[PDB]
Design an enzyme around this catalytic site. Structure first.
Site, mmCIF file in Angstrom:
data_model
loop_
_atom_site.group_PDB
_atom_site.id
_atom_site.type_symbol
_atom_site.label_atom_id
_atom_site.label_comp_id
_atom_site.label_asym_id
_atom_site.label_seq_id
_atom_site.Cartn_x
_atom_site.Cartn_y
_atom_site.Cartn_z
ATOM 1 N N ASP A 288 0.850 -1.184 0.000
ATOM 2 C CA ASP A 288 0.000 0.000 0.000
ATOM 3 C C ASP A 288 0.897 1.249 0.000
ATOM 4 O O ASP A 288 2.148 1.152 -0.011
ATOM 5 C CB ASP A 288 -0.998 -0.062 1.160
ATOM 6 C CG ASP A 288 -2.300 0.723 0.911
ATOM 7 O OD1 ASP A 288 -2.321 1.659 0.074
ATOM 8 O OD2 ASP A 288 -3.310 0.427 1.576
ATOM 9 N N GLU A 494 -10.926 6.127 4.250
ATOM 10 C CA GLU A 494 -9.797 5.834 5.123
ATOM 11 C C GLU A 494 -10.047 6.405 6.510
ATOM 12 O O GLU A 494 -11.170 6.339 7.003
ATOM 13 C CB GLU A 494 -8.475 6.363 4.538
ATOM 14 C CG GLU A 494 -8.151 5.866 3.158
ATOM 15 C CD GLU A 494 -7.452 6.944 2.335
ATOM 16 O OE1 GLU A 494 -7.617 6.938 1.090
ATOM 17 O OE2 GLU A 494 -6.757 7.799 2.934
#
Length: 605
Positions: A288, A494
């Site tokens: 990521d 997020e």
């Protein structure tokens, strides 16, 4: 047969032979370059050539400009590819993007419902068809790789990415892995589980993310610790990765999260021992974004260690995405010093090249201008509209068992009211990962709001009044037959989405109370997850959980006005209070407001 023949450039040769042929010719710099993915924002022709860069991405909102056409995207991607093809070996780059509910960074792309709503459809073939349409719209922009599907199993809706999970029930997530062969194409008959697959230039490489237990973190805290024994990890969070292997997912992205205190980005046992060695995954494993940086506390405090730990753990490609010079310099030093063996570098590069050759990228490194018209194509919008309608969950349809059912509503009435913060706000109905990572407010792309859908649906004699936040007197005096009122969550993703109270912003409830106090009302709740809903229910004649339905608001009115019946069923538990959380189907103390699978139905008018 020509005297200048190079086996890896021969399209008729087996992929593994091409991989081995190219690998054997590469310098260390060429190898480490393949393992490096950078942001378009830091890319230039010289940077891409000089560092032998393997991949680029657009992060959320990273676009050539606001409102860019499909052709502008193709020209940008091709400009980067021209630089990569001009290297000594001419290895094409692969360009990745978060196309997670359509090609959602792009202006005019069809925006599909987010995953939680798709879970409500219990329709894996619908999700396959969405993958197919999304591949076409990604290829319209010249991009070859989508960071999807998110196969998290969200176990606590306080997580800011719960809308990216199809369900708290792994069986539903497993069923929805059909997105993969939609995006990539169907694998052939004899296919070996764990091999990568992409059919060709009209499909894209997919990415099962984020490995593993991203949906299991304590209190739904994004990027945090998932505390669960191996048995639970393997029973809840892992199963859909095996389905993804069986369907030939080309890549897997690692989670920021930890499992029992071990960072996934440093977990050799799970990345190499399990994913690669047990599931036999033969595609590439990608980090990521600054995921290796976050191995340490504070993040980025020992980038040398970050590189060593992540590459030794078995990661193949690093989403740097900005500090490429440092990444390359540090990894080169580690190899030069014997800290990271050439065997590990060769494995990473073997996997990256395997995906690139398999997908046809050496044969079609450039965009197809004839595909630009796939962007926002009406056929795809018709599909999104079907999906939005199937995603809707009817939670209430009458205040008492003896009231006339409010829905379906009549299309012909003298005067009707459409109200609420979410009735005419395209950005809000799309939610996060739309144009920007966090999403946005207002008319951010091409679509149809709920208000616009109502106006398109009703009889010509029906007068439609819009008021965003009317008072009780306005409603009582208005001569309305009924109202449609839409409220809910603002867009997020997020960590910004992590939320311990799960109450919708005001004015939301106050508007529902004012409207429903004066006229019979259908409340449409826009959210990424269950939210505190008893007060909304108490005020409303009917209430629909519409999730984040995307660009095609007519999906909502298709069910409100009875063109189709309601069929959606909750893909998650609806809690009575956040003090109960976490609380999932099958738990011991299970006391839901609405159980997983709940949904009222209507029949078409």
């Amino acid at each position: 047969h020509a005297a200048d023949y190079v086996l890896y450039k021969d399209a008729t040769k087996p992929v593994e032979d091409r991989v081995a042929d190219l690998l054997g010719r590469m310098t260390l710099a060429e190898k480490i370059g393949q393992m490096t993915q950078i942001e378009r924002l830091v890319a230039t022709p010289d940077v891409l050539r000089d560092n032998f860069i393997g991949s680029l991405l657009s992060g959320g909102g990273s676009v050539p400009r606001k409102g860019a056409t499909a052709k502008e995207w193709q020209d940008m991607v091709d400009g980067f590819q021209k630089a990569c093809m001009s290297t000594r070996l001419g290895i094409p780059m692969i360009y990745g993007i978060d196309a997670v509910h359509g090609q959602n960074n792009v202006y005019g792309a069809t925006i599909f419902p987010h995953n939680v709503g798709l879970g409500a459809t219990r329709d894996p073939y619908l999700v396959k068809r969405i993958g197919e349409a999304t591949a076409l719209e990604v290829r319209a922009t010249g991009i070859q790789y989508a960071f999807a599907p998110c196969i998290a199993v969200c176990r606590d809706p306080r997580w800011g990415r719960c809308y990216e999970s199809y369900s708290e029930d792994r069986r539903i997530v497993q069923s929805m892995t059909e997105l993969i062969p939609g995006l990539q194409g169907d694998v052939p008959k004899d296919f070996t589980s764990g091999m990568p697959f992409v059919a060709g230039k009209n499909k894209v490489a997919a990415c099962a993310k984020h490995f593993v237990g991203d949906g299991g973190t304590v209190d739904g805290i994004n990027e945090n610790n998932t505390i669960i024994n191996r048995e639970g990890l393997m029973n809840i969070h892992m199963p859909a990765y095996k389905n993804a292997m069986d369907k030939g997912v080309s890549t897997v992205m690692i989670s920021y999260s930890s499992w029992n205190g071990v960072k996934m980005h440093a977990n050799q046992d799970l990345v190499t021992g399990y994913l690669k060695d047990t599931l036999k995954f033969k595609g590439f494993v990608i980090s990521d974004w600054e995921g290796i940086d976050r191995i340490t506390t504070p993040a980025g405090s020992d980038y040398s260690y970050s590189v060593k730990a992540s590459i030794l753990a078995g990661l193949d490609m690093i989403m740097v995405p900005n500090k490429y010079q440092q990444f390359i310099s540090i990894l080169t030093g580690h190899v030069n010093g014997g800290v990271i063996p050439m065997s590990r570098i060769d494995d990473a590069v073997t996997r990256i090249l395997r995906v690139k050759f398999t997908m046809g990228l050496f044969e079609n490194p450039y965009a197809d201008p004839a595909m630009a018209e796939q962007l926002g194509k009406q056929e795809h919008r018709d599909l999104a509209r079907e999906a939005a309608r199937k995603s809707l969950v009817l939670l209430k349809n009458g205040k008492t068992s003896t009231d006339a059912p409010l829905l379906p509503l009549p299309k012909k009435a003298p005067k009707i009211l459409v109200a609420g913060s979410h009735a005419d706000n395209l950005g809000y109905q799309c939610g996060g990962w739309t144009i920007e990572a966090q999403g946005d407010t207002g008319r951010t792309t091409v679509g149809t709001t709920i208000l616009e859908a109502v106006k398109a649906a009703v009889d010509p004699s029906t007068v439609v009044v819009f008021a965003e936040n009317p008072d009780a007197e306005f409603v009582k005096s208005g001569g309305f037959s009924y109202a449609i009122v839409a409220v809910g969550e603002h867009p997020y993703t997020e960590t910004k989405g992590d939320n311990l109270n799960l109450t919708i912003p005001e004015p939301g409830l106050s508007t529902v109370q004012a409207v429903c106090g004066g006229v019979r009302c259908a409340t449409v709740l826009i959210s990424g997850r269950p939210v505190v809903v008893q007060p909304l229910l108490a005020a409303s004649d009917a209430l629909v959980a519409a999730w984040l339905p995307g660009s095609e608001g007519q999906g909502v009115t298709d069910a409100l006005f009875g063109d189709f019946g309601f069929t959606g069923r909750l893909p998650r538990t609806w809690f009575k209070s956040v003090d109960q959380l976490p609380m999932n189907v099958g738990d011991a103390h299970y006391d839901p407001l609405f159980r997983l699978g709940y949904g009222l139905t209507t029949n078409a008018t």
